[PDB]
């Protein structure tokens, strides 16, 4: 959508294939001077940047610590977990001892 986030797309940062739509209508040539008067709507990237909202880092519950390259959360605590534990009998000590 022209003027909206994600106006330009690409499967890869350098993929040859690209698609977009941002309301580019050409304008008639002006007086006596060769040029190309054009028109188009501002990038949705900058608009969304000005109003992207605050990062999730400052809004997640339970004090999540979030990192990008794994896109994971860490040291974020909530709930309970059952656990089953097997133990060698060697670690155990006879009572008389």
């Amino acid at each position: 959508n022209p003027g909206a986030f994600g106006d330009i797309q690409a499967s890869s940062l350098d993929a040859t294939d690209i698609v977009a739509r941002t309301d580019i209508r050409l304008l008639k040539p002006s007086v006596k001077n060769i040029h190309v008067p054009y028109t188009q709507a501002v990038s949705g990237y900058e608009m969304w940047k000005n109003n992207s909202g605050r990062p999730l880092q400052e809004t997640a519950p339970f004090g999540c610590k979030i990192e990008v390259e794994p896109l994971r959360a860490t040291n974020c605590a909530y709930g309970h977990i059952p656990i089953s534990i097997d133990i060698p009998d060697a670690a155990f000590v006879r009572s008389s001892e």
């Binding site: 580019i24 209508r25 050409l26 008639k28 006596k32 060769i34 190309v36 054009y38 990038s43 670690a91």
Partner: protein, 97 residues
């Protein structure tokens, strides 16, 4: 952020042209007639009706994009990984599961 392209126009001196098609993202073309372009050495060509001008426009990711790029992600099926330290009878163990 995107950078537009304004290629050198296709000007036919005292002839005719058309509006072709291309695979470029946001590719557009448009034509006009009866145009007298000028330049420092003077007027390159004038023909009251036979002159025609053809302009085209498209867009590509800006060179700085390589580092300013953002990405849209589809996430699902949250999975957990937990690191534990377990001590039994002064027998310590560091585990992750």
């Amino acid at each position: 952020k995107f950078h537009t392209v304004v290629p050198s126009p296709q000007v036919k001196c005292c002839g005719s042209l058309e509006c072709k098609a291309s695979s470029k993202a946001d590719y557009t073309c448009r034509v006009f007639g009866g145009v007298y372009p000028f330049m420092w050495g003077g007027a390159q060509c004038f023909c009251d009706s036979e002159n025609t001008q053809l302009s085209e426009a498209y867009v590509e990711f800006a060179p700085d994009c390589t580092i300013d790029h953002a990405v849209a992600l589809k996430v699902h099926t949250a999975a957990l990984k937990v690191g534990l330290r377990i001590v039994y009878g002064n027998t310590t163990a560091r585990l992750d599961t």
